[PDB]
Design a protein around this nucleic acid. Structure first.
Lengths: 99, 59, 64, 215, 150, 126, 84, 136
RNA sequence: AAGACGGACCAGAGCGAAAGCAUUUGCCAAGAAUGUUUUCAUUAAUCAAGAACGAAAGUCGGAGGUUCGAAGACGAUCAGAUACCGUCGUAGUUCCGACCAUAAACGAUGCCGACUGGCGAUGCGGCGGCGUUAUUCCCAUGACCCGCCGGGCAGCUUCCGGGAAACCAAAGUCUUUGGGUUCCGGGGGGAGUAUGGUUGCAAAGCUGAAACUUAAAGGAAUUGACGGAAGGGCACCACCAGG
């Protein structure tokens, strides 16, 4: 049987799609069958900002943000626990956890 | 607020009728932006920007 | 590269961590500049307050 | 195996923004001593200075990295000319977001000066006054049409208003709002932002204008 | 059931139950046919004639005005399109793909649709060959496709 | 950490409270000797845990009814305070601003009131 | 519904909301209108879903703006089917 | 070639061009054009370890020695140019990016401005790896 | 400079018969939806044959080779790795014109038509609104909201019904057994092998067995147990610090 209904993510309204590698394993998975991830993150992360912002002189400019769109293969999403094993009743859930 | 009065620094340098159209709408924004008491620097700031309001024949 | 010894007192134990839960997370506020608050770890068992003789604030001792 | 002391051989060159920037002297660069045994005039006047506006204007912004070719170095002073302004990555990828129509416009447009410029743009949609849709899209027909006005006004204002006046339009996006306003009867367009300025042609004949840029 | 076309929607109108349409201004047979015979002189399809009979005039169709429809009027006149007008646009559809196929030897869409359009022709035109509408000895052909449209 | 109170103390102490809330107090050696007097506990140490948890309960229940145990002197007094009169269910909302369809329901009920208006900035509810 | 109803004469909104070929009695609601625009000196019969221009001679080139849906009007007019 | 007019008292800017990558963290400050670098110091210049060249502690050694020679040579302030690998690659900086900027802040080189300098393709040319890759 | 590719935007979305389709822009004819008192007057349906198309690698011949990269080889990996790994790299990838005709071309799910339940979206077109926004001097625009219509993508939801269950408004209206038309299976193998046909340049593709072998094969689901599956707690027969 279908262990997954959407099989990672559905491909309905699309006969065929483009594939993607893993961002950390370079493994070929389809675009709408993989795990995507946006990352909005400071370039000035909290290890340095206690010393950067004090030496940031002539700097009334706000902290910049890095914008990274990640895409994993399923094999390196699970072992790294980007996604992980949930119950099959939880496998119905299309819900991403909040950031 | 070191940038809001310094908005109109380059708003006024880059002029040509798009900016005095825009710069009225900046000062519409700049008024309740940083919703504070007009202490001194807002009589410094807003009396440059409300001055820039009344100059340009605004709304 | 090189920096002198900093006496940062414990403000708060932040936990007992590590593989065995024995590496004591500690908020050592800098004790000299009251805005600087660094976070280091302690190998041994600490009850709070005691001035920890940080030879460095570099190589930041964080969660493990 | 081999090190030198080249800091007995560098000369400081006062990097000058034009006088349409209220900070002209951007900074100083220890350029290696331009001479017969060591020619460095090409790494002096071929210097493109990639500086953000904060040290250029005196501060409306601290993004928007202008590229600055030095048309003439005049006595330890790198009197720069404009090359290409940006909207750099943190400012640039902030506006990029899912569930909007990302609207783009690349143009290649000659200045009234002798400079061919490229101008690439970006645009985005809004969730309007009463909109309950999560996203913000339209028909692709409106998507094509907004790009046509966006290329049009961008080719227009840079064909006019010779190179330094292109610099003196686009910091609050003089091309920007009119693309929103002319489309506001169709779509009011919360973003128009010209981002990639690439100088395609750069003749040095504006040395008097370089003295009009500066001083 | 549509194997002739991939559609599942609607291209056809509704018609009211009454044969007395519109019963406020029923412009006569002479009103519609002298318009029709001028439009037959102008040479429009009944699909095009019946639209301009509908919207311009005070009447909608000639099946409510007369007993005959337009092609029935055109047959009773004798001045009628010698191929069915819907079949004529079917043959018109194939030439437009074929010329486009004559332009693009790479448009694989135009290679597939020209099969189905002519298959829609070969199932339609065959029927008119039977009932003495098309001559049955005549047969559709890509040579005769552009010949009938031109 | 340890010797936390199981089912046997709490179930036994609950019956003791609701019957003896006068003769129970907050002193242990009272309530330990009261649980000598009023209860048959097969150990002194069990009586220590019961009557001590009675002192735990009596301190709680003299702050009113706490969760998991209540006395009808406290319970019915809630109902005696639940004679509360908030209205007369006639404000008067005689003619005031109501919905225009409630007005139309009032039109079907022949009284009428002031009607809401202005479908404006839709969704009405957003 | 409680799945027990019979509407031999239903309300005229549940058929009238349907498509014209999806009705209980399939008769369209598209109709003729009579155009009172002053661009013509006359009143000209135009179908609702006209799909095409309808003009006159009392006007030169405008009596209606065409529309594949119900036809676009200029300056306001009357309209009457009449009797569909 | 000492400083321009003084080596302290003015903010004559150098630009960081810190190519923070995996297995090295280059701290490599140029002139404002970029053509003329000073202080060719890698993160593994200080600790040639070949597994710790991008590590935070070795970059603190690397950035501060650059930060030493910058304020030695009249460059007293730095525009932060913290670069990842960039391009059609992993485009992710190493661990020697947080501590080293903190280190040069502790060293004394001023920071006026912070801006992102990482290049990303439009999905350009092909990536290293076959279909399977390192299978997990 | 080279050649590659348009990320992110980019979705239970669109279009397209599928195989499919992500820079702009243009050309080209196409196709869907919708609306349609237009027209044809039933022309309809489904489908052996037959035909188109049909990923990829392969091959045919080039360009192309930036990038990568079966092979290939090391560096490392392991008892063994040729593998993963690191390095370099051939064919290939790139693309043209050919073959190929295959794919898990999978939705593991004939077509068409009918009938049987609740909701909320979204792409689309048309419509309903003292709806908002929006421009010109405002309308007519459009953005958008509520509503509707469809044909969508689908989703959620319920003794709708079924099903071995899994699940499914279809995998319902079946023993109360019949809409129509096409396709296919008769326990498990041997075996798509043999055999011949057959194509393809080949690679291979297609049609398609027997001897013999067997009382089980299979499917869901329950329950354990296991995991170099994952998430919880505790013991100095477990650690730590230790003696």
């Amino acid at each position: 049987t279908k262990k997954r209904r959407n099989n990672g993510r559905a491909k309905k309204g699309r006969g065929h799609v483009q594939p993607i590698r893993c961002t950390n394993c370079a493994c070929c998975v389809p675009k709408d069958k993989a795990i995507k991830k946006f990352v909005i993150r400071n370039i000035v992360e909290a290890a340095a900002v206690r010393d950067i912002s004090e030496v940031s002189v002539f700097d009334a400019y706000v902290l910049p943000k890095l914008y990274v769109k990640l895409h994993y293969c399923v094999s390196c999403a699970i072992h790294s626990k980007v996604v992980r094993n949930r119950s099959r009743e939880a496998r119905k859930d299309r819900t991403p956890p909040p950031r | 607020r070191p940038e809001n009065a310094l908005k109109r620094a380059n708003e006024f340098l880059e002029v040509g009728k798009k900016q005095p159209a825009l710069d009225v709408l900046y000062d519409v924004m700049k008024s309740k932006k940083h919703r504070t008491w007009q202490k001194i620097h807002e009589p410094i700031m807003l009396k440059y920007l409300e001055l820039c309001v009344d100059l340009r024949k605004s709304h | 590269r090189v920096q002198p010894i900093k006496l940062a007192r414990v403000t708060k134990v932040l936990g007992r961590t590590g593989s065995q839960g024995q590496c004591t997370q500690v908020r050592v506020e800098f004790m000299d500049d009251t805005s600087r608050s660094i976070i280091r770890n302690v190998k041994g068992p600490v009850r709070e307050g005691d001035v920890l003789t940080l030879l460095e604030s570099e190589r930041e001792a964080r969660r493990l | 195996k081999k090190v030198v002391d080249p800091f007995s051989k560098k000369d400081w060159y006062d990097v000058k923004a034009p006088a349409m920037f209220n900070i002209r002297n951007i900074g100083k660069t220890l350029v290696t001593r331009t001479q017969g045994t060591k020619i460095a005039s090409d790494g002096l006047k071929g210097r493109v200075f990639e500086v953000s506006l904060a040290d250029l204007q005196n501060d409306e912004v601290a993004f928007r990295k202008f590229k600055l070719i030095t048309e003439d170095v005049q006595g330890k002073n790198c009197l720069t000319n404009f090359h290409g302004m940006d909207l750099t990555r943190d400012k640039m990828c902030s506006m990029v977001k899912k569930w909007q129509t990302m609207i783009e416009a690349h143009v290649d447009v000659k200045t009234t000066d002798g400079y061919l410029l490229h101008l690439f743009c970006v645009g985005f949609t809004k969730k309007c006054n009463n909109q309950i849709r999560k996203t913000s899209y339209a028909q692709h027909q409106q998507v094509r049409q907004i790009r046509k006005k966006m290329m049009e006004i961008m080719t227009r204002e840079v064909q006019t208003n010779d190179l330094k006046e292109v610099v003196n339009k686009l910091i609050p996006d003089s091309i920007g709002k009119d693309i929103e306003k002319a489309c506001q009867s169709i779509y009011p367009l919360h973003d128009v932002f010209v981002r990639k300025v690439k100088m395609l042609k750069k003749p040095k004949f504006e040395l008097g204008k370089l003295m009009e840029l500066h001083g | 059931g549509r194997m002739h076309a991939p559609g599942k929607g609607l291209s056809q109108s509704a018609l009211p139950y009454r044969r007395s349409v519109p019963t406020w201004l029923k412009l006569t047979s002479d009103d519609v046919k002298e318009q029709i015979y001028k439009l037959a002189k102008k040479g429009l399809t009944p699909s095009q004639i019946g639209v301009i009979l509908r919207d311009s005039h005070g009447v909608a169709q000639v099946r409510f005005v007369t007993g005959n429809k337009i092609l029935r009027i055109l047959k009773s006149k004798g001045l009628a399109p010698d191929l069915p007008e819907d079949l004529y646009h079917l043959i018109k559809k194939a030439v437009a793909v074929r010329k486009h196929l004559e332009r693009n030897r790479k448009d694989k869409d135009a290679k597939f649709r020209l099969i189905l359009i002519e298959s829609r022709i070969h199932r339609l035109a065959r029927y008119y060959k039977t009932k003495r509408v098309l001559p049955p000895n005549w047969k559709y052909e890509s040579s005769t496709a552009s010949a009938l449209v031109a | 950490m340890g010797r936390v109170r199981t089912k046997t103390v709490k179930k036994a102490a609950r019956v003791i409270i609701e019957k003896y809330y006068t003769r129970l107090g907050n002193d242990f050696h009272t309530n330990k000797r009261v649980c000598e007097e009023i209860a048959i506990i097969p150990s002194k140490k069990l009586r220590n845990k019961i009557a001590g948890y009675v002192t735990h309960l009596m301190k709680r229940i003299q702050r009113g009814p706490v969760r998991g145990i209540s006395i009808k002197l406290q319970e019915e007094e809630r109902e005696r305070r639940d004679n509360y009169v908030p209205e007369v269910s006639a404000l008067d909302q005689e003619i005031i601003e109501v919905d225009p369809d409630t007005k139309e329901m009032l039109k079907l009920l022949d009284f009428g009131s002031l009607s809401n208006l202005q479908v404006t900035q839709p969704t009405v509810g957003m | 519904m409680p799945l027990a109803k019979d509407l031999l004469h239903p309300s005229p909104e549940e058929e009238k909301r349907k498509h014209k070929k999806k009705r209980l009695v399939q008769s369209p609601n598209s109709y003729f209108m009579d155009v009172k625009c002053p661009g013509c000196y006359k009143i000209t019969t135009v179908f609702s879903h006209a799909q095409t221009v309808v003009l006159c001679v009392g006007c030169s080139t405008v009596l209606c703006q065409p529309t594949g849906g119900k036809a676009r009007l200029t300056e306001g007019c009357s309209f009457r089917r009449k009797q569909h | 070639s000492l400083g321009p007019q003084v080596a302290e008292g003015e903010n004559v800017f150098g630009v960081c061009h810190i190519f923070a990558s995996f297995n090295d963290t280059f701290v490599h400050v140029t002139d404002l054009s970029g053509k003329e670098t000073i202080c060719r110091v890698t993160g593994g210049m200080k600790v040639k370890a070949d597994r710790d060249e991008s590590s935070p502690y070795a970059a603190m050694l690397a950035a501060q020695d650059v930060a030493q020679r910058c304020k030695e040579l009249g460059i007293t302030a730095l525009h932060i140019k913290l670069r990842a690998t960039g391009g059609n690659r992993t485009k992710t900086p190493g661990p020697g990016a947080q501590s080293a900027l903190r280190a040069l802040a502790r060293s004394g080189m001023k920071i006026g401005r912070i801006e992102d300098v990482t290049p990303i393709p439009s999905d350009s040319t092909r990536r290293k790896g076959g279909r399977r890759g390192r299978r997990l």
